[PDB]
């Protein structure tokens, strides 16, 4: 009844999955079907989407450095994840992880969302900072649910169009 | 609205709390009032109680070695937490952590239990393996709720008395 198997060496697991912790995959979930969602996120990767997680998110930047673009108290801000840092993000704080370094690795821990508790993915205008587009999602399989979501934003000049100042958001890369 | 503060260096935090990660305290919670309960557990420590956590528990043995005495599929068993190992324990698997080494440190992550979801603490007979005593608890503050619980077991020859074979459990140390 050890449903998720025996203990195992983490650094070797990370080493062994180096090829997955780089584009295009980027990340790898450690156990499947668990309530705790346990993921290692490599790099490099940059993104323009901001995440609205209705639950907490735990980070431990095991290797290399990264940072989180955030919206804290109405202002754009940056939290660094230097190698060795840990950090706990409160529910709903908008965050956009940037991971510039190859070979970096970050332990990220989350919980499954109950039915009816949704995640938000959002984009903001570089020009005036207004919200450009939000999609909410019952997030069961990030790996497969999120790329079509992001993909549809990039493809729609409409979705990318700031309702405040008309600036068309750049889409994929800032 | 970074309610749990900024990122910070984890190894230095652990170093700085060395005096707390040894008897009598043994462990230190990283953030307070979070949904994710994030704890570093040092040593040495041995115990005879088995935990029935109604939710999952995540371990990452950062420094030194430890092990978990378990009841898996009706049998007494041992899962080692060698330095570097990670491990995810499924809900309700009975476990009794033993941490023989000084200077060891283990990241343990849990979730707050909703109202009405209780933890069990249990003891088993060395002689016949039958359940000797179980207390259930709405666990809000392990640090302060658990010592009086354990304490009351040790003090009662009655509670320590195996209902199957009459052997009085040794209590504090095996
Ligand atoms: Fe996220
Ligand atoms: Fe705008
Ligand atoms: Fe436990
Ligand atoms: Fe017995």
Approach to solving: X-ray
CATH number of A9-174: 2.60.120.10
A75 burial type by CB count under 10 A (0-12 exposed, 13-18 middle, 19+ buried) = exposed
**What are the tokens at A126?**
């570089």
For residue A81, which residues of chain B lie inside 8 Å, CB to CB? 7
Q: What is the DSSP letter of B34?
A: -
Calpha distance B35→A90 (Å, rounded) = 9
> Does residue A52 sit in helix, strand or coil?
strand
CB atoms closer than 10 angstroms to residue A26: 18
Give me ligand 4 centre to Cα B49, in Å. 15
**What are the tokens at B66?**
């430890």
A57 burial type by CB count under 10 A (0-12 exposed, 13-18 middle, 19+ buried) = buried
Nearest CB among B4, B35, B79 relative to A7 is that of: B79
Look at A109 and B81 and tell me if their CB atoms are within 8 Å: no
Calpha distance B106→A30 (Å, rounded) = 18
Place of tokens 């462990």: B27
Give me ligand 3 centre to Cα B95, in Å. 7
- What is the DSSP track for A126-151? TTT--EEEEEEE--S-HHHHHHHHHH
Where does chain B break, by residue before each gap (C–N > 2.5 Å)? Answer: none
The domain locations on chain B are 9-174
For chains A and B, CB pairs below 8 A equal 116
Give me ligand 3 centre to Cα A74, in Å. 39
Calpha distance A125→B104 (Å, rounded) = 48
Name, in order, each residue with C-beta under 8 angstroms of B166's C-beta and a sequence gap of 6 or more.
Answer: none
For residue B89, which residues of chain A lie inside 8 Å, CB to CB? 2, 4
List, edge to edge, every strand of the sheet that includes B66-72. B75-81, B66-72, B94-98, B50-52, B119-124, B131-137
Nearest CB among B4, B7, B35 relative to A85 is that of: B7
Calpha distance A103→A43 (Å, rounded) = 6
For B66, list phi and psi in degrees, rounded to 5: -155, -175
């Amino acid at each position: 009844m050890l449903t998720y198997g025996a203990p195992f060496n983490f650094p070797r697991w990370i080493d062994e999955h180096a090829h997955l912790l780089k584009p295009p995959v980027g990340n790898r979930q450690v156990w499947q079907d668990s309530d705790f969602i346990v993921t290692v996120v490599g790099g490099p990767n940059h993104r323009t989407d901001y995440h609205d997680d209705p639950l907490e998110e735990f980070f431990y930047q095991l290797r290399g450095n990264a940072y989180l673009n955030l919206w804290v108290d109405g202002r754009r801000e940056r939290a660094d994840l230097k190698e060795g840092d840990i950090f706990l993000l409160p529910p709903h704080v908008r965050h956009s992880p940037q991971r510039p370094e190859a070979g970096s690795a970050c332990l990220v821990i989350e919980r499954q969302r109950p039915a009816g508790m949704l995640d938000g993915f959002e984009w903001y205008c570089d020009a005036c900072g207004h919200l450009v587009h939000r999609v909410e999602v019952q997030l069961k399989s990030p790996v497969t649910d999120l790329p079509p979501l992001f993909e549809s934003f990039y493809a729609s000049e409409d979705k990318r169009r700031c309702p405040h100042c008309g600036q068309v958001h750049p889409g994929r890369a800032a």
